[PDB]
Symmetry: C3
Subunit: 206 residues, 3 copies
């Protein structure tokens, strides 16, 4: 009997990284004052100060930006500033009790073939974990993405996953999910965590 | 001279669980039998009781069950529950039956590797790999329920009533009809819930 | 938190480094000069023979093959098989080529982790991961839920050791109720593929 064996699992990665991936809500204003949900995506808490990376397209033209953590807290987020060049954006929240932060190993080098998990909020179903591998680590020549430094992955990505996290089996941030190529299957992209940290730092000081 | 490096494989879980997952066919009369809908099913014990999805065997004149070893039986409807979309069948076989491995003490964790086992598009038994994406929801959500297993192991029509197992072959849940163009978003009833439902059908009906 | 600095990430990078250098981008060019169709191919042996998709190279004026190391060659068509959708190309072997690892005594098992290697949508070589979903599919075929897209045809399906399991063909296309099938692709088993190649080489 298997009663004593151990099921293969990436649960250790989920427990390490998941608590820091938040649900981002873009609220508009209904014709018939009250606020409705225009768009929604994911986001990631980078440090204790309360900074959060997310997608620009998710927060554009937002009357109110709402951020929901997996522990049930809900904050209103301030727009720190977006990047027109890399499609990122940085939010800020004012929390009292301390925050969960995404693990970051600045010395880790993502390799093609590494198992990765996508973490986000597809179709507003609640936080979801999907599993894939890094399919590519940037491109040298000209290619359909127009950029040379995108991580590609086949971890399923859907509307709502944008601005969310892509971690490896250790729960270390590999990148930030963007958009999914659209009848394609298992083709998604992420901004490398190195580049994302630089863009954030810049948007924060500036 | 030739070394014994072995490739990563979830074949152990397949050899353990797969034999107990069956292709379920629903027959109709045109005055000659023919297939109307098909799906998957799971053999729960030696007596020959099988779990499948209710909608798969709705209004069926003859239910047929095909095992992976090539045996084919006629099955009898024992009961059905609309609330949980679960149905139970019964087959009478001479030899022994392959039963799905169950560990009532195992608890499904988010991130566990899982295999979906069923008969998609009637291609024969297919096995696809993914992980547990979620183990239910506390809040109100678009599925309308609070106890669905969500998995990103590919689920297609014909997978309903089939088995979601872990890397050990242990039943985690029963796959149900999955969810404009979503990718890697499927659902299953938790195995604990399913078993309880089945027992009620067998005796109560 | 915790220090994962010395922990090791689960990875199939060993398989990539072994098999990927031998999976090339195939381009069907036509006069108009331009690119008409494109797929993938696999370098089998040092003689410069490559397996690919019959539909990728059909009605081609100039077949081009592109290795990942930057080299680009002009391939000649050795012959194609009507029955199996496999085609064989031949390039200049001078200079040494990367070859796909082959273990002729390895038996694919249902549940084996496999990696597909090809050129989906001309994004550049892409690696996807799945498992052997089934064997001996007659419509012999390996089935796999390693994501396949247009461009993957004629590319490689290899296990975690990087050994060749089969050559990718097309996906499943039949929509039951106006829906899109997911994680269903097929591949000519590596045993059969080798025989087809040998026979096409021999018949040419």
């Amino acid at each position: 009997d298997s009663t004593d064996e151990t099921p293969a699992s990436y649960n250790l990665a989920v427990r390490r990284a998941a608590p820091a991936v938040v649900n981002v809500y873009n609220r508009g204003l209904n014709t018939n004052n009250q606020l409705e949900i225009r768009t929604l995506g994911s986001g990631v808490i980078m440090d204790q100060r309360g900074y959060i990376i997310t997608n620009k397209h998710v927060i554009n033209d937002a009357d109110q930006i709402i951020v929901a953590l997996q522990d049930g807290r809900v904050f209103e987020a301030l727009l720190v500033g977006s990047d027109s060049l890399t499609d990122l954006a940085v939010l800020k929240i004012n929390a009292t009790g301390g925050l969960p932060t995404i693990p970051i190993n600045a010395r880790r080098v993502p390799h093609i073939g590494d198992v990765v998990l996508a973490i986000g909020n597809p179709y507003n179903l609640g936080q979801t974990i999907t599993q894939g591998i890094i399919s590519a680590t940037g491109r040298i020549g000209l290619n359909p993405t127009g950029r040379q430094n995108f991580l590609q992955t086949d971890a399923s990505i859907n509307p709502g996953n944008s601005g969310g996290a892509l971690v490896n089996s250790l729960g270390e941030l590999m990148g930030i999910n963007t958009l999914s190529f659209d009848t394609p299957e298992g083709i998604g992209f992420a901004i490398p965590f190195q580049l994302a940290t630089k863009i954030m730092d810049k948007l924060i000081r500036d």
